[PDB]
Write an enzyme that holds these catalytic residues in place. Structure first.
Site, PDB file in Angstrom:
ATOM      1  N   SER B  45      -6.168  62.888  61.059  1.00 54.77           N
ATOM      2  CA  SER B  45      -5.926  64.234  60.556  1.00 54.77           C
ATOM      3  C   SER B  45      -7.151  65.146  60.624  1.00 54.77           C
ATOM      4  O   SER B  45      -6.995  66.365  60.489  1.00 54.77           O
ATOM      5  CB  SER B  45      -5.392  64.128  59.123  1.00 54.77           C
ATOM      6  OG  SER B  45      -4.757  62.855  58.931  1.00 54.77           O
ATOM      7  N   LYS B  48      -7.097  68.381  62.738  1.00 54.15           N
ATOM      8  CA  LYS B  48      -6.463  69.642  62.361  1.00 54.15           C
ATOM      9  C   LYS B  48      -7.481  70.775  62.255  1.00 54.15           C
ATOM     10  O   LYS B  48      -7.125  71.945  62.445  1.00 54.15           O
ATOM     11  CB  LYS B  48      -5.679  69.462  61.053  1.00 54.15           C
ATOM     12  CG  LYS B  48      -4.465  68.533  61.220  1.00 54.15           C
ATOM     13  CD  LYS B  48      -3.820  68.152  59.898  1.00 54.15           C
ATOM     14  CE  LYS B  48      -2.465  67.502  60.114  1.00 54.15           C
ATOM     15  NZ  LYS B  48      -2.358  66.145  59.508  1.00 54.15           N
ATOM     16  N   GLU B 141       1.473  65.176  66.056  1.00 58.60           N
ATOM     17  CA  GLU B 141       1.827  64.377  64.893  1.00 58.60           C
ATOM     18  C   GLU B 141       3.215  63.768  65.081  1.00 58.60           C
ATOM     19  O   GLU B 141       4.143  64.455  65.519  1.00 58.60           O
ATOM     20  CB  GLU B 141       1.824  65.235  63.628  1.00 58.60           C
ATOM     21  CG  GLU B 141       0.494  65.843  63.298  1.00 58.60           C
ATOM     22  CD  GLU B 141      -0.480  64.852  62.716  1.00 58.60           C
ATOM     23  OE1 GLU B 141      -0.126  63.666  62.538  1.00 58.60           O
ATOM     24  OE2 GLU B 141      -1.608  65.277  62.411  1.00 58.60           O
ATOM     25  N   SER B 212      -6.253  60.264  57.871  1.00 60.13           N
ATOM     26  CA  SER B 212      -5.785  58.921  57.556  1.00 60.13           C
ATOM     27  C   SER B 212      -4.838  58.466  58.655  1.00 60.13           C
ATOM     28  O   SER B 212      -4.083  59.276  59.199  1.00 60.13           O
ATOM     29  CB  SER B 212      -5.065  58.878  56.199  1.00 60.13           C
ATOM     30  OG  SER B 212      -4.957  57.544  55.727  1.00 60.13           O
TER      31      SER B 212
END
Lengths: 165, 263
Positions: B45, B48, B141, B212
């Site tokens: 993540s 992002k 994702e 994560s």
């Protein structure tokens, strides 16, 4: 621990007030405002990149508004998951929820989000189910075979699966 | 001491049974302390940040881009989308999607940023444009989080990410208004209380983005404003040998405690 849990999520009902939500969830677990608007967002154990949680939406910002929306992530586990790719492929848009559950397994799914845009009228209710293969659900990390099935007025409008076999 | 930082990071890594990567840049004197600083790690993540920054960069030319409404449809929901699901069958702006990706790690939000950029390659092309030759985002994702050892997809190094985060949040990779927007979003992160933030003095201001994924991968990248000195940039990456390992936010907090002793 007393953080947000699936038991608390099940205890909170459509129609309840903000203070009822806070009492049942445990006020220290919960927040409103910011990106959640006038919804109440309550956190549980650490999971993924962010905690298991519930979000409760309300009919208005008024102190007497009622729960018209329940969403949860990693609070509820499926009771007897039996989803497979073959079963998923028998599902078709236009099926009722009962028809979907008879196809994927009555205990394969949990309620991801459920919303009554005309509460207390049930007209237009939207429902997102997450359904899992026998070893697909995880309360802490990625699913190992899961599907998203979404309904309007109890009728399947779409579906997607990840990693079913 | 400097030696204590290296010994204690190695001991932390050993006791955790995983692989730890750290980069701390002190902008007061342009120093950088590294641990496995040039090894690749799965970003999960933390990527992002680069997706939001790439959209910010686009908005320097398409000046109304962040106000563009983007439809949120049930088919866009993936596995974890706490802000997007509030707006399903409605719209969110690209500014809202950027904030949701950064502050809640919303995966639908991330995928909307990626789609705006023409795919994962659009994020990686922005990285190249600001001089980052190491970063690579290859997937959307949720599969960008598979974190398979030796798989270069969706990886970077601690050195590369600390440098790039520095350029984005403290330097000139973005316009001044876009830099302010990014820093404002990062300072409002809600996912990081147990990671780098938990190991630093409470009076220090932190903007961070966690990550994560599989292999118990647990990451955090931060820009840090101590009271009384120049800002710092800290990257902490951690990953484990078993696909189903549990996340270890506490290891990142410990790494932060350790490396701060060398300041």
């Amino acid at each position: 621990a007393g953080v947000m849990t699936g038991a608390k999520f099940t205890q909170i009902q459509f129609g309840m007030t903000r203070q009822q939500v806070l009492d049942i969830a445990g006020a220290e677990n919960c927040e409103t405002g910011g990106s959640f608007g006038d919804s109440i967002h309550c956190r549980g154990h650490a999971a993924g990149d962010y905690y298991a949680y519930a979000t409760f939406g309300f009919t208005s910002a008024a102190a007497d508004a009622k729960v018209d929306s329940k969403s949860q992530w990693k609070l509820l586990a499926p009771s007897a998951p039996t989803l497979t790719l073959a079963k998923f492929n028998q599902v078709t848009v236009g099926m009722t929820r009962a028809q979907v559950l008879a196809t994927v397994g009555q205990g394969s799914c949990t309620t991801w989000s459920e919303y009554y845009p005309a509460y207390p009228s049930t007209a237009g209710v939207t429902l997102s189910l997450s359904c899992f293969d026998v070893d697909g659900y995880s309360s802490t990390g990625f699913y190992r075979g899961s599907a998203h099935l979404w309904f309007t007025d109890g009728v399947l409008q779409g579906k997607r699966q990840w990693d079913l076999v | 001491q400097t030696s204590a930082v290296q010994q204690k990071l190695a001991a932390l890594e050993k006791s955790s049974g995983g692989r730890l990567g750290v980069a701390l840049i002190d902008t007061a004197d342009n120093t950088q302390v590294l641990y496995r600083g040039d090894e690749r790690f799965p970003m999960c993540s933390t990527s992002k940040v680069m997706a939001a920054a790439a959209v910010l960069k686009q908005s320097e030319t398409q000046k109304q881009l962040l106000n563009q409404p983007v439809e949120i449809k049930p088919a866009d929901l993936v596995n974890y989308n706490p802000i997007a699901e509030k707006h399903v069958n409605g719209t969110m702006t690209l500014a809202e999607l950027s904030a949701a990706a950064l502050q809640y790690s919303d995966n639908t939000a991330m995928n909307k940023l990626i789609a705006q950029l023409g795919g994962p390659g659009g994020v990686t092309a922005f990285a190249r444009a600001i001089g980052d030759e190491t970063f690579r985002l290859d997937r959307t994702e949720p599969t960008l989080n598979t974190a398979i050892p030796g798989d270069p997809r969706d990886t970077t190094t601690p050195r590369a990410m600390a440098q790039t985060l520095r350029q984005l949040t403290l330097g000139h990779a973005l316009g001044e208004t876009q830099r302010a927007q990014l820093v404002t979003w990062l300072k409002g992160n809600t996912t990081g209380a147990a990671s780098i933030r938990a190991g630093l003095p409470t009076s220090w201001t932190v903007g961070d983005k966690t990550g994560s994924g599989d292999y118990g991968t647990t990451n955090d990248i931060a820009v840090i404003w101590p009271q009384g000195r120049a800002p710092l940039v800290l990257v902490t990456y951690f990953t484990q040998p078993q696909q189903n390992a549990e996340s270890r936010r506490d290891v990142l907090a410990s790494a932060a405690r350790i490396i701060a002793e060398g300041l």
